[PDB]
């Protein structure tokens, strides 16, 4: 699992918003700098900036 | 005016969510009542997330 190092507010409908310290499962990381991630807290899924998270 | 140095996601009803680079005017502790010039929303923000 990965952890958010910063808050992130969605800038498009298919982004995932998240808070610093949120645990995230990376669901796809093969399409570029934005990874598809799943929030273990909220259950939501969406794209996130890969540089805002780090392996937990 | 103040600028957001970081994104902030609201954690309470009266918090203000904002994005890095958003311009804010403080209206009035460590949490300040701020008005977003970009979105028009008003709520409390962590004072250490913004800069003049």
């Amino acid at each position: 699992t990965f952890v958010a190092l910063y808050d992130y507010e969605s800038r498009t409908t298919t982004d995932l918003s998240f808070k610093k310290g949120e645990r995230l499962q990376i669901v796809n990381n093969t399409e570029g700098d934005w990874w598809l991630a799943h929030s273990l807290t909220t259950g939501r899924t969406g794209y996130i900036p890969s540089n805002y998270v780090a392996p937990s | 005016t103040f600028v957001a140095l970081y994104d902030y996601e609201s954690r309470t009803t009266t918090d203000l969510s904002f994005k890095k680079g958003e311009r804010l005017q403080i209206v009035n502790g460590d949490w300040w009542l701020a008005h977003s010039l970009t979105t028009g929303r008003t709520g409390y923000i962590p004072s250490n997330y913004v800069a003049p």
Partner: peptide, 11 residues
């Protein structure tokens, strides 16, 4: 916070 990276390449 870090700069947001560029969005993903179109498929």
């Amino acid at each position: 916070a870090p700069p947001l990276p560029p969005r993903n390449r179109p498929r």
